[PDB]
Automatic annotation (TrEMBL):
It comes from Bacteroides thetaiotaomicron (strain ATCC 29148 / DSM 2079 / JCM 5827 / CCUG 10774 / NCTC 10582 / VPI-5482 / E50). Residues 11-93 form the IPT/TIG domain. This is IPT/TIG domain-containing protein. CDD domains: IPT_PCSR. Pfam families: TIG. It comes from the Bacteria. PROSITE patterns: PROKAR_LIPOPROTEIN (PS51257). SUPFAM superfamilies: E set domains, YWTD domain. The keyword Iron does not apply.
Length: 400
C-alpha cells in the first residue's frame, strides 16, 4: 500500500531478463512508495550505473525504460529514499551499432544546400553535434559552416566564407564556438537562439602566427583554449575578450597545418588533449602548458590496437569523449577508421571502419568504411557525428 520508513526496500524479480534500448522493464518488490521523485533505477554495468527513466510506480512495482548500457548481463539497482538494493539476477542487454551516411558522398562535390539527399559538400575538417540530430560542419575548401538537421531533412549554410576547424560545443548545446584558421583568427559564436547564425566575439591577433585547427572550452566555459601549428598554446575569454599566450609547447618537430593540431578538453582530469598528424600521437597538455606523451608514435604511422602504451595511429585527426571518459579518435590516411581508447581498460580498439579502405559503406560498424574521417563529435546520447575530408560527407556512428 504505502511507503514505510521503518522497512527496507526489497526487490524480488524483474522482467524481461533481456532486451535492447528503451525496453520496458518491470521490477517487482516492496516499499517503493508512490513518489517517483524519491526513486532512482540504474542498470549497472562494468563502467557505470546507467540511470533509467521510471515511467510508473506503485509500492510493489517499478516500470522503467532500459537505458544505453554495456552489452551483457547487468544488475538492476533500485534506490528509494536512500535505501539501495541491487538484484541477484542480471538483465542481458543487446547493444546495437550502426554507421550511416547522413548527407554527402565522395561522388558529390559541391556546396549545394537542399535536403539530406540533395546536398553536396567539399572537404570537411570540423564538426559540432548540437543535439536533436543536428550538426554544424566546417568545410576547408570553399570554406563555410553548414547546418545539417536530420529530423528536418535539411542542409543549409549559416556562415559562407568562414574557414575554421574543430569547434567547441557548450554542455547545454546552446552555443558553438569557432576560431578562424588563419589571419587574425576571428572568434565566432553560433547560437541556437539565432538559428545558429554567427556572431563575432573577438579575435586572437596574428601573434598566434600558426594555423588554428581546433578550439576547446575550459570547465567553466568562460575560456576557449587552442594550440596553433607553431606550438603557441593560448586562451581567449568569451565574455571579456582577454587573450593570453600560455606557453609555446616544448614539442620537437613540425606540427601540421591541415588544419593544425586537434585539441579537446577532458572532463575527467580537466587537462587538454592534443592530436597531431605529423607526430601521429596524442599528448596531454595541462592548463599551464606542460605536455606529456599520451598515445602513439611519431615514427610509426600505422593502425595498431592494444594497450594505450603500445597503440599506434596512421593519421590521428579529430577527437571526442563519451560520458564514461572514453576517447574517440578518427584515423585518416592509411587508416580510415574510428579508434576508441577505453579508459577503464586502458585499451585502444578500432570500433568502426576497415583499415586502409577509403570508401563509404554503411551498416554494422566493422563492415562499414570511412573516407578520410577527419573530425568527430559526440551528441551525449550514443551518436558520434563524423565529418569526412575526401569523403565530402557527414557520417554517424550510432551506439544504442
Amino acid at each position: 500500500a504505502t511507503y514505510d520508513p521503518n522497512q527496507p526496500v526489497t526487490v524480488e524479480s524483474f522482467m524481461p531478463v533481456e532486451g535492447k534500448l528503451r525496453e520496458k522493464v518491470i521490477v517487482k518488490g516492496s516499499n517503493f512508495g508512490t513518489d517517483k521523485s524519491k526513486v532512482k533505477v540504474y542498470f549497472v554495468d562494468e563502467a557505470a550505473e546507467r540511470l533509467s527513466t521510471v515511467i510508473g510506480i506503485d509500492n510493489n512495482t517499478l516500470y522503467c525504460l532500459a537505458p544505453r548500457q554495456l552489452p551483457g548481463g547487468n544488475r538492476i539497482k533500485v534506490i528509494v529514499d536512500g535505501k539501495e538494493v541491487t538484484t541477484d539476477g542480471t538483465f542481458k542487454y543487446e547493444q546495437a551499432q550502426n554507421v550511416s551516411t547522413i548527407s554527402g558522398s565522395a561522388s558529390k562535390d559541391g556546396n549545394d544546400d537542399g535536403d539530406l539527399a540533395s546536398a553536396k559538400f567539399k572537404y570537411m575538417w570540423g564538426i559540432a553535434a548540437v543535439g536533436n540530430n543536428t550538426v554544424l560542419a566546417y568545410q576547408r575548401d570553399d570554406p563555410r559552416v553548414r547546418l545539417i538537421s536530420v529530423d528536418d531533412n535539411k542542409v543549409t549554410t549559416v556562415h559562407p566564407g568562414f574557414k575554421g576547424g574543430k569547434p567547441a560545443v557548450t554542455k547545454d548545446k546552446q552555443r558553438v564556438y569557432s576560431i578562424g584558421w588563419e589571419g587574425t583568427h576571428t572568434v565566432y559564436v553560433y547560437m541556437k537562439a539565432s538559428g545558429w547564425a554567427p556572431t563575432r566575439i573577438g579575435q586572437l591577433g596574428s601573434t598566434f602566427s600558426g594555423k588554428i585547427g581546433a578550439v576547446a572550452l575550459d570547465e567553466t566555459e568562460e575560456w576557449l583554449y587552442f594550440v596553433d601549428s607553431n606550438k603557441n598554446f593560448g586562451r581567449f575569454n568569451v565574455k571579456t575578450q582577454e587573450v593570453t599566450l600560455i606557453k609555446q609547447l616544448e614539442l620537437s618537430g613540425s606540427l601540421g597545418t591541415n588544419p593544425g593540431p586537434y585539441l579537446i578538453y577532458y572532463f575527467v582530469d580537466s587537462n587538454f588533449y592534443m592530436s597531431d598528424q605529423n607526430l601521429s600521437s596524442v599528448y596531454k597538455i595541462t592548463p599551464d602548458g606542460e605536455c606529456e606523451w599520451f598515445c602513439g608514435s611519431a615514427t610509426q604511422k600505422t593502425v595498431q590496437d592494444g594497450l594505450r602504451e603500445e597503440a599506434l595511429f596512421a593519421q590521428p585527426n579529430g577527437m571526442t569523449v563519451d560520458e564514461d571518459g572514453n576517447f574517440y579518435i578518427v584515423d585518416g590516411f592509411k587508416g580510415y577508421c574510428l579508434r576508441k581508447l577505453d579508459i577503464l581498460d586502458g585499451y585502444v580498439s578500432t570500433v568502426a571502419g576497415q583499415v586502409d579502405v577509403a570508401s563509404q559503406i554503411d551498416g554494422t560498424p566493422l563492415e562499414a568504411t570511412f573516407n578520410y574521417p577527419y573530425d568527430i563529435c559526440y551528441d551525449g546520447e550514443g551518436g558520434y557525428w563524423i565529418a569526412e575530408a575526401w569523403g565530402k560527407a557527414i557520417r554517424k556512428y550510432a551506439v544504442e
